[PDB]
Amino acid sequence: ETYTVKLGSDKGLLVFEPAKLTIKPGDTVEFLNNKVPPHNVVFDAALNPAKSADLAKSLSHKQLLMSPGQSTSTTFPADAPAGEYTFYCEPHRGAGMVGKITVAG
């Protein structure tokens, strides 16, 4: 469901904790721009079982989220089996700001 991904663990570092969110087929989780911004995430049409963006595209977000203290949400279909729908913090892509949504299956 709509859970919060604190894009750079607010009083911690520029990371995606707890990195492996094992969500369910749908989960309207949000990406939250807490500090050192912005954080937008494209979706892995590269790193995952169903690396098929067309499934929704909304899945793969992007373009500088200048939301000082606010979040954006990414919903799935119900037709989401064994999926590691990995997400990208674009201007940070590598500094441990990468996450792997794991829809059970």
Partner: protein, 254 residues
Amino acid sequence: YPFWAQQTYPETPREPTGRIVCANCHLAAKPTEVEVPQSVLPDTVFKAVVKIPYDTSVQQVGADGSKVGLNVGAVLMLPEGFKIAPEDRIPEELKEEIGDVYFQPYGEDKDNIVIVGPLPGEQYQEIVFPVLSPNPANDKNIHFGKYSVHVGGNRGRGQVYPTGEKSNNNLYSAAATGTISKIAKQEGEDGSVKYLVDIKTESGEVVSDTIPAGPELIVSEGQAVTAGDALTNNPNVGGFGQLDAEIVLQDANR
């Protein structure tokens, strides 16, 4: 973006030529302004206001080919000792002027260099940087004297990535002399794949440059073309500018 400049020039944003690394990739040149108070007293907050104007009606090619408005960013270089003012010292009148921007230091060590961006330009053509003035009594190396303040102000997309690849906000020159034997705009997903070939009749060789979505052609089939000639218009409607101001850290007495 400022962030690439941070990632690969932490101690050389003002190249020894006096030019700022933004120029390296944001190639076009457009004006940037900066007003700064004539003088300031130790340990007081003041505002270095920077302007990065441009005809707002213009539009630029986005990364995907569609056309969209521009965003803005900047680098402000202060002397050592000077630094972003903390929140408690920013009064409310100044606080509303800054909106809700987030100044980052260029590097944790470089407190005196302060960046911002990308942010929409419609909202932030002008930017107000709070700055706490230092105190010689509590800082021996700092003194009551004139001081320079350089600035860089960008608008719109640049032409080259840190890897050296071109972006689709730039001129695609020919990589060949020759005649053009075939052309075809095709549609892919976000935007057109432009396709073409050149016959280097001189060297008896064929090549197939490729042009991304967003630009639009000058040349046609069967036209003689020279190496390095402009195949497309230049779609860059943004650019980069820089200037400096002087500031007098002033003794309370005279």
